[PDB]
UniProtKB/Swiss-Prot annotation, chain B:
This is Probable DNA-directed RNA polymerase I subunit RPA2. DNA-dependent RNA polymerase catalyzes the transcription of DNA into RNA using the four ribonucleoside triphosphates as substrates. Second largest core component of RNA polymerase I which synthesizes ribosomal RNA precursors. Proposed to contribute to the polymerase catalytic activity and forms the polymerase active center together with the largest subunit. Pol I is composed of mobile elements and RPA2 is part of the core element with the central large cleft and probably a clamp element that moves to open and close the cleft. Component of the RNA polymerase I (Pol I) complex consisting of 14 subunits. Belongs to the RNA polymerase beta chain family. Signal peptide: none annotated. It is found in: Nucleus, Nucleolus.
Curated annotation (Swiss-Prot), chain C:
Signal peptide: none annotated. Component of the RNA polymerase I (Pol I) complex consisting of 14 subunits. This is Probable DNA-directed RNA polymerase I subunit RPA2. Belongs to the RNA polymerase beta chain family. It is found in: Nucleus, Nucleolus. DNA-dependent RNA polymerase catalyzes the transcription of DNA into RNA using the four ribonucleoside triphosphates as substrates. Second largest core component of RNA polymerase I which synthesizes ribosomal RNA precursors. Proposed to contribute to the polymerase catalytic activity and forms the polymerase active center together with the largest subunit. Pol I is composed of mobile elements and RPA2 is part of the core element with the central large cleft and probably a clamp element that moves to open and close the cleft. The chain holds residues 344 to 392 of 1174 of the full protein. Coiled coil: none annotated.
From Swiss-Prot, chain D:
The chain holds residues 870 to 917 of 1689 of the full protein. This is DNA-directed RNA polymerase I subunit rpa1. Belongs to the RNA polymerase beta' chain family. It is found in: Nucleus, Nucleolus. It comes from the Eukaryota. DNA-dependent RNA polymerase catalyzes the transcription of DNA into RNA using the four ribonucleoside triphosphates as substrates. Largest and catalytic core component of RNA polymerase I which synthesizes ribosomal RNA precursors. Forms the polymerase active center together with the second largest subunit. A single stranded DNA template strand of the promoter is positioned within the central active site cleft of Pol I. Component of the RNA polymerase I (Pol I) complex consisting of at least 13 subunits.
From Swiss-Prot, chain E:
The chain holds residues 6 to 62 of 119 of the full protein. Component of the RNA polymerase I (Pol I) complex consisting of at least 13 subunits. This is DNA-directed RNA polymerase I subunit RPA12. It comes from the Eukaryota. It is found in: Nucleus, Nucleolus. The lineage of its organism: Eukaryota, Fungi, Dikarya, Ascomycota, Taphrinomycotina. Belongs to the archaeal RpoM/eukaryotic RPA12/RPB9/RPC11 RNA polymerase family. The N-terminal zinc-finger domain but not the C-terminal one is required for rpa12 function. DNA-dependent RNA polymerase catalyzes the transcription of DNA into RNA using the four ribonucleoside triphosphates as substrates. Component of RNA polymerase I which synthesizes ribosomal RNA precursors. Required for growth at higher temperatures. A zinc finger (C4-type) spans 5-25. Zn(2+) 1 binds at C5, C8, C22, C25.
């Protein structure tokens, strides 16, 4: 079905964590961030990947990547993951609480989280992306 | 030949100026505009280094 | 006055950083003027001087 | 103006200032340009 | 929302370490006056490429 076709499309499709995040604020002090996500059914229209999958992927992989980018900018400026709080029931905000030595130089955390979420993938068949459907009444899928 | 000297250097070298004068000239408005404030701070700090 | 303008300049630069200003187009007769003959003539003349 | 208001989403009797803000908001991007002009082009082509 | 000295302009070091003193002017200041420094940082507009943003424009 067209429903089944669109489903299968979304399945083979890849998507990045940034494609779901709304505006994000990071709170300074303690070093705490809270992300906004889009509403679950509006989340499952353009998608249909699941909430617990968001939890799993966000937590592990996004924390890893964020730590990578933080450490690397720390290495350039030279010249730990403390707390996680996801909206486990409603799935509509993602707080992460980080703690840092006070001696370090400031951080453009805004650009950092944006770079992070724009980098981590939720699910991607390796080396494929952008599956679409384009019409002779011949149901076909056209994938880059 | 190209030559790269930090802006903060030539700034404090231009006028006998206090860093507070820099900060209140650069973003002195709308006190605590997030982006401008944190970037300017980083700049003053990295020159102070 | 150089100092004040440097301030204005870095201020505009940061505004551009955060998308608070559209990119000036150097590829447009808007951001452009003309060189004459006599002027470059005087400049190279001064150079040889 | 018909295709314009339609693509933006406002109606043809919409207030001038509202559509003004919309259009300024539109073609600071480019995809919004692409869609808008694509609509306008289909429309003019129909007429033509 | 920053901490400059008034004798020197030295951008002072964080007080959550200890009492505040500028490294050059060596001026003493009450550290607790400006405790609880809040900077509420917000992502700038047009920052997240959506698949629904056009439905919001
Ligand atoms: Zn001082």
């Amino acid at each position: 079905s067209d429903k089944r076709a669109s489903a299968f499309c979304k399945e083979v499709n890849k998507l990045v964590l940034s494609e779901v995040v709304r505006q994000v604020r990071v709170t300074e002090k303690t070093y705490a961030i809270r992300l906004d996500l889009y509403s679950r059914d509006e989340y499952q229209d353009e998608y249909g990947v699941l909430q617990e999958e968001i939890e799993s992927t966000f937590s592990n992989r996004f924390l890893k990547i964020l730590n990578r980018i933080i450490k690397s900018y720390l290495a350039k400026s030279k010249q730990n993951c403390k707390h996680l709080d996801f909206d486990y029931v409603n799935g509509e905000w993602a707080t992460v609480e980080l703690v840092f030595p006070i001696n370090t130089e400031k951080l453009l955390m805004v650009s950092l989280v944006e770079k992070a979420c724009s980098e981590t993938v939720i699910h991607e068949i390796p080396g494929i992306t952008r599956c679409f459907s384009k019409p002779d009444t011949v149901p076909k899928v056209i994938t880059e | 030949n190209e030559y790269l000297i930090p802006s903060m250097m030539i700034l404090k070298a231009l006028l006998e100026t206090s860093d507070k004068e820099i900060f209140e000239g650069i973003v002195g408005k709308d006190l605590g505009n997030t982006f401008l404030t944190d970037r300017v701070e980083l700049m003053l700090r990295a020159y102070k280094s | 006055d150089k100092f004040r303008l440097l301030l204005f300049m870095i201020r505009k630069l940061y505004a551009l950083v955060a998308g608070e200003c559209c990119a000036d187009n150097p590829d447009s007769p808007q951001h452009q003027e003309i060189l004459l003959g006599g002027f470059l003539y005087g400049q190279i003349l001064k150079e040889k001087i | 103006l018909e295709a314009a208001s339609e693509y933006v989403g406002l109606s043809t009797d919409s207030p001038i200032a509202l559509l003004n803000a919309n259009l300024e908001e539109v073609y600071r991007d480019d995809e919004k340009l692409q869609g808008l002009d694509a609509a306008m082009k289909g429309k003019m082509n129909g007429l033509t | 929302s920053l901490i400059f000295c008034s004798e020197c302009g030295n951008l002072l070091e964080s007080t959550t370490a200890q009492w505040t003193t500028c490294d050059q002017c060596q001026s003493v200041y009450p550290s607790e006056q400006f405790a609880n420094l809040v900077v509420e940082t917000k992502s700038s507009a047009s920052a997240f490429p959506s698949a629904l943003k056009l439905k919001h424009s």
